[PDB]
Amino acid sequence: EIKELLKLGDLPTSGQIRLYDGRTGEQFERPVTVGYMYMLKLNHLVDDKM
Amino acid sequence: QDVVLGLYYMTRDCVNAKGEGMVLTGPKEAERLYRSGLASLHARVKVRIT
Amino acid sequence: RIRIRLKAFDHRLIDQATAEIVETAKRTGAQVRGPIPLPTRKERFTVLISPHVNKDARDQYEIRTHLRLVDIVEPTEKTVDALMRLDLAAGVDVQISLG
Amino acid sequence: KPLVGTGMERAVAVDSGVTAVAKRGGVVQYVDASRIVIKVNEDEMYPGEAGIDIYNLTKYTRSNQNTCINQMPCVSLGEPVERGDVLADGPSTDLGELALGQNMRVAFMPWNGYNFEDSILVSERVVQEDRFTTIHIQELACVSRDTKLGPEEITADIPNVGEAALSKLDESGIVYIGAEVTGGDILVGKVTPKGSDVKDSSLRVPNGVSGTVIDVQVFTRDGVEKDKRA
Amino acid sequence: REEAVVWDILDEVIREHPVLLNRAPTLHRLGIQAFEPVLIEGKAIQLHPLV
Amino acid sequence: TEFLKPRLVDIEQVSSTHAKVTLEPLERGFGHTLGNALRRILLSSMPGCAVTEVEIDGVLHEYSTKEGVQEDILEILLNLKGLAVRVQGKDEVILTLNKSGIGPVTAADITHDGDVEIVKPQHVICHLTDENASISMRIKVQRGRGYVPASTRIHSEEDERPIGRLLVDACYSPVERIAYNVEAARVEQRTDLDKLVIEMETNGTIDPEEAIRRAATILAEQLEAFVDLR
Amino acid sequence: TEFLKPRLVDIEQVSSTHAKVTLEPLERGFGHTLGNALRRILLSSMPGCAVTEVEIDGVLHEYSTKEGVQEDILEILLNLKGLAVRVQGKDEVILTLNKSGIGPVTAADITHDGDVEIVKPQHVICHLTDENASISMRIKVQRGRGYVPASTRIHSEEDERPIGRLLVDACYSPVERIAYNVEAARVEQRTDLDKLVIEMETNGTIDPEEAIRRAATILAEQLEAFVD
C-alpha cells in the first residue's frame, strides 16, 4: 500500500530519488532515500547547557 | 563508521563499469578520470604505481 | 504643463527634494523640463543686542529662502497622481500648478 | 500536523485539557480577541438561562517547564460547531490533532562527515522559516524583605552605578514592560541604605538570557505606589 | 562589554595553549585528552570524530 | 582556442513567478560548470526587499493580542515576513496599512506610494471580525541580501530608534528554487554543443534576465582577482 | 550591496611544477563556487598539445613485443603518454626517433623540428638491451583540449589505419592534479567567511599560476557576453 500510494502520486516506487550535490552539481551515485520524517525538538537546548 | 563505509565503497570493484580494463599512467590521472566523468570509482584497471 | 515651486531655508535639503521630485516624475512620465534655480531671497534683519543701551552694538541676521522651479511638460495619468502619495522632506514648501 | 500519525492524536489532544472543547454546540459570535462566544442551538439549550457560552483563551503564559502554553482559535466567525468539537488549539495541537514536532524533508546519506555518530545536518530553510523557533518564558521574583538595619527599597535612584541603571524602568523604579532586555540589565531597582553604605541587590537579568517583559505582577507590601500609579 | 579589540587578544592567548577535554564518565586514561582550541561561532564543542 | 560564447536566446514566462530561461550556445563540458555556479550565486547572493520593522499602534510587545482580529500578533508578523515588495528608486521606504470593517485584510489594502509595487494582491494578513475594530500598522522595507536575523540586528542598528517598533527577521533573498538542465543543442553544423535551461522560481519581485545579469557580474568580478593578480 | 574582494596572499612554490595558492577571504559559500568552476575548467577544457598516435615497426597491435628492450610496448605507450611536448606554430606534427646502442633512450634523443621542443629531455622513454636493436617510432602530435582517452578514441574512429599505428590517451591539458579545500578565515566581526587553498601540480610547458590565470580568463571571456 505504500508502493501503491507512491504510484498515485507521481513519485518513484522504490522511495528513492536520485539527488545531486549542491557543492559540486554532480549526481550522487546509487540513489538515496528522501521522504518526510516528523522530527521533534527536545527541550535539551544548548544555551541552557553551555 | 562513516569513513569505513566511504573506503569500502571506494576500494571495491564491479565486473563492468565505465573504463573497464583501460590503462593509466599514474594515480593522479586515476583521480582525474574519476572527476571528469570518464571512469567509475570501482572499475578494474592496470595502473602504474611507484 | 505642471510648474513646481520648491521653497526652503536649507539649500542642500531643497536640492535633495528637487532630485527626488525629478525621480518621481521621470519613471512614470516623460520629458521632465528640469530643476531651474530662481533667485534666492536674502531677507536681512538688524537688531540691537544690548538689553538697554548701546546702539552701535548690533547683530545682523538673515533668512536665505531658496527657490527651485521644476516643470513637467507632459502630465500623464500615472505621473501626476504619483506626487499625491509621494510627500517630500520636512522644511520644504512645494507648490505644484498645472497650466 | 504529523503526516504519518496513528489516529490516536485526536484522543490525546482532546482528552488532555489543553484545547477548548465546546461544551454545547451551535454557531458563533466570535468577539474572540478576548473570548470565543458561541451561540447555542435550541435543542441543547436550557429553557431558562437563555445562555451563550463564552470561552476564555489562555494566552502567553508560563508552563511548568518554562515552555509557552498558548491557545489559538481554530474556528472562524459564523461557523457551526457541534458538542465535543474543539474550538481553540492549545500548545502543540493543529485543528484538534496533536503536533509535537514538525514534518521535514529528510535525506538518508552521509554528507561530508557532518552527521557522523548520531548528528543531524540541517539546511538554512529550517532556520529561516522559524519552524523550530520555540518560545520560552521565565518568571523572576524580586522581594525587598526586612532582613536587618531597616527595610529594603524599590527606587530607581540606584547608586555608584551611573546612567546605566535608570533605563528600562520608570521614575519610581521597576522595569517599564515590553523592551529588548538581555543580560546584565536592571528590572526591579530593590536596594537599601545602611545595608556611603548603599548596595545593589536590585534583581537584574541573568547572564546569557534576552527577552521581552511580557507581564509584571505586584501584590506588594500595602504601599507600593509612588504618589499614585497604585 | 566585549569590544572589537579583545577578540584579537583572544586569538593571541589561544594559539599554542592546550585544553583538557573530558567526557563525564571517564573510565580509562584516554577519556582526558588535550587539544588545541579553534574558536567556534556557536555554543557547542566541536570534537574530532576519530577521537 | 576554438571556443564560442553563449547568449540568452529565448526567455519564456510560464507564469509571473515561475519562469524558465535558455542559454545558447555553451561549449562541451561547460554546461554543468556554469549551471552549478549560477545556481550557487543565484541562491545565495541576490538583492531583494523585505519587511524589517513593523509598527502597530496601541501595542506593547509582539506576544500580546489585539482588539477585533484573528491572527495573533506573531501570526501577523509571520504573514508580513512572507510579503513580496518591489521598490524602484529608494532603498528604504515606509508603507501604511489602514482598514476597518468586518472581513479579511489583503495585501492590496496597503496605501501604496508611487515607487513601491506590491505584487501579491491576495496575500492575507489579518481577519478583522469586529466592525468597530481598526488596525493601523506602519511597515518599514529595507533592501539587502542573505539572511540577517533579529538577534544580530539587536545591536547592529546604529540609528537610535525609539521603543515600540517590533523587529521582524529579514529574509532578503527573492530566489527560492532554481534548477538547470544541460540538454543537447540544436546547432545546424555542430553536434558537440549544449544548451543550459535554467528554471528559476522567484518571489515575483525580481526580473529573471536582470537576476542572471547580476549573478554573471558577481561571478566575473569575483574571478577578476584570479585574472589580474596572478 | 557590496562584495568582498580578496587578496591573493600566498604562492608557496614547493617545486617548479607545484603551487599552493592560499586565498582569502571570500563570501560564505563562494570558495566552493570558484574552486569547482576552476577545477572543472582545468580538468576538461584547458587547451594544449600532446602525443596521440604512434607508428612503430615490429609491432602489429598493442599486445605484441619487440626485441632488445626490457619493457614492453604497453610500457612504451605509457612512457610516451607521460611525455609533455609543446607545439608553437602548427598543430599536427609527426616526429620520428631512432636509437641504437647499449643504453636507455631519453627524450633528448628524438629528432625535433624548429617548431617543437621537449620540456623534459631527461624524461625516459625506454631502455635498450641489445646494441644491434634499432627502435623506430613515428610519433604524431595533435593539439586539442583537456583529456580524451584511447578507449573512446577507438570507439570514435572508423577509418582503417595501417597496421602498426598505436593509439594513446591524449593528455592535452597541461595540469596533472588540482584539488582544493575551503578553510575558514575571519574578518574582525563576521566569522562566517571562507578561505580558498588551491593546490596544483602540472607537467612541464607551463607555470601553475599561468594555468590558473588561463582558466580564469577562459571563464571570464566565456561569461563576457551578458554582463553590465
Curated annotation (Swiss-Prot), chain D:
Disulfide bonds: none annotated. Coiled coil: none annotated. It comes from the Bacteria. DNA-dependent RNA polymerase catalyzes the transcription of DNA into RNA using the four ribonucleoside triphosphates as substrates. Belongs to the RNA polymerase beta chain family. The RNAP catalytic core consists of 2 alpha, 1 beta, 1 beta' and 1 omega subunit. When a sigma factor is associated with the core the holoenzyme is formed, which can initiate transcription. This is DNA-directed RNA polymerase subunit beta. It comes from Escherichia coli O157:H7. The chain holds residues 697 to 945 of 1342 of the full protein.
